[PDB]
Amino acid sequence: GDFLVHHAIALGLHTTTLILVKGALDARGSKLMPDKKDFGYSFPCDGPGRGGTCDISAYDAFYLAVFWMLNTI
């Protein structure tokens, strides 16, 4: 049981830091939004164009990582 729950803990840590690292490294731009640094840390979106850009900013990656952090802890 400790094995399984420690691996769940590892999944939580790894996914939380995945979301956070991916919001930190894609923070200055991506392929979907290469000029993201010009829009700031927090900003709503870039519109429904280019397929849809809901939750595109690094702030949104943090906001998505807080759920996974709460689940990890």
């Binding site: 790894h14 830091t17 995945l18 709460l70």
Partner: protein, 73 residues
């Protein structure tokens, strides 16, 4: 004991989410790619897709197999 552990672990999770949040805020607001020409910090953004895809693989593997063993049991 229970309260102290849960307290400090949730505090730690929030603080650790904020660490990466402010790392992203740094990359957007404070990071100069010209004054960090070729150092470890730029070398991070250089292979950021590798980092993110490998964190994706570890998260995916741990989730698949932890959930699968739990569901099997």
């Amino acid at each position: 004991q229970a309260a102290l552990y849960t307290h400090h672990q949730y505090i730690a999770g929030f603080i650790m989410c904020g660490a990466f949040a402010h790392g992203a805020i740094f990359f957007i607001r404070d990071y100069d790619p010209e004054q960090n020409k070729g150092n470890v910090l730029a070398r991070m953004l250089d292979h950021k897709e590798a980092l993110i895809s490998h964190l994706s693989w570890v998260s995916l593997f741990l989730g698949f197999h932890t959930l699968g063993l739990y569901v099997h049991n």
